[PDB]
């Protein structure tokens, strides 16, 4: 059976620190502990090993990106711009 109604992993804080600060931290706390897709090896095995460090369990590759997610939205746009500027030359 479901053990909490609204908070999930945030239930470890009890009644402390306020609902809005808990909600904002919950989104990043869930993502920083989740499995992210590995473009190499095609597995969902990327885990954070420190702020900005991601190591895939499947292929043992280490990637630098994102404090709480594997790839920030800014990096996705930057990757597209660089490839576009590379083809223009």
């Amino acid at each position: 059976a479901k053990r909490t109604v609204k908070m999930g992993v945030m239930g470890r804080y009890g009644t402390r620190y306020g609902a809005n600060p808990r909600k904002r931290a919950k989104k990043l706390e869930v993502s920083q502990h989740a499995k992210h897709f590995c473009s190499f090896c095609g597995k969902f095995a990327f885990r954070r090993k420190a702020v900005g460090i991601w190591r895939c369990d499947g292929c043992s590759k280490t990637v630098a990106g994102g404090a709480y997610t594997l790839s920030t939205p800014n990096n996705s746009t930057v990757r597209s711009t660089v490839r576009r500027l590379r083809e223009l030359a």
Binding site: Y13, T62, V63, A64, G66, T72, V82
Partner: protein, 258 residues
């Protein structure tokens, strides 16, 4: 009176960097002959975390250009760099994320990090996590490149200064609320002795200009002159304005006519 805390920290003493457990300065490779005329190929060996720094660090192995040995330089890792990646540094390096190129070889609008303020300084700009510079234009007459700094300021540097393509890894760190005094305790454990912070109005008048009073108050304006001597220069130093900013946050810093 007594020496104010802000002035006491200039002696160093117990307020210095907690440098133990740090891997060392992070820098680009030396701007040598191979960089100036060709390129050097390196292999990313590891991605490591250093205490007190949000951005990830990369150990890149190069061959010595003159001797039979390896070099193994340590630089700030851009986002997306991975172990086993080939890194190209030099004049002829292709435009790709993680490569280090002269600023004059980089197109308008390319996002760069680890930018050299002066040619050969091994990277001094856009080094904090999630930060980057935007190239505005080049001017071939005077050999200068114009870029937009992370603070919004516009700066011109020689075109021979090197930049790394991409953005610094570890972005989004500040968007997570700390929620706990203990979490702030661990954050500054690797940096220096600067936390917790005691308000000046909470101190005694012997220690701080804001100290004293039968009520906790600053009895004088907190905006102080730029010429005030140390011990008097506390509060809002040489503030151009105060209060809530409405209708656009202006670019902070000093005006540069360039």
């Amino acid at each position: 009176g007594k020496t104010v805390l802000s002035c006491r920290k200039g002696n160093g003493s117990v307020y210095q960097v907690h440098g133990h457990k740090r891997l060392g300065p992070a820098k680009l490779r030396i701007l040598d002959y191979a960089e100036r005329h060709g390129y050097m190929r390196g292999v990313v060996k590891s991605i490591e975390h250093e205490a007190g720094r949000g951005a990830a660090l990369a150990r890149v192995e190069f061959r010595h250009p003159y001797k039979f040995r390896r070099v193994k330089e340590l630089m700030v890792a851009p986002e997306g760099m991975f172990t086993g990646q080939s890194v190209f540094c030099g004049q002829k390096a292709p435009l790709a994320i993680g490569n280090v190129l002269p600023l004059g070889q980089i197109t308008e609008g390319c996002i760069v990090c680890n930018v050299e303020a002066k040619p050969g300084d091994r990277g001094t700009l856009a080094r904090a996590s999630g930060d980057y510079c935007i190239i505005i234009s080049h001017n071939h007459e005077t050999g200068r490149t114009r870029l937009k700094l992370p603070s919004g300021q516009k700066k011109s540097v020689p075109s021979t200064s090197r930049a790394m393509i991409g953005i610094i890894s570890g972005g989004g760190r500040i968007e997570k609320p700390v929620l706990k005094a203990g979490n702030s305790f661990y954050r500054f454990r690797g940096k220096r002795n600067c936390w917790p912070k005691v308000r000046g109005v909470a101190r005694n008048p012997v220690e701080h200009p804001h100290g004293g009073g039968n009520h906790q108050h600053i009895g004088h304006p907190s905006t102080v002159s730029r010429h005030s001597p140390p011990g008097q220069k506390v509060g809002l130093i040489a503030a151009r304005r105060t209060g809530r900013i409405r209708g656009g946050k202006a670019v902070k810093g000093a005006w540069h006519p360039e």
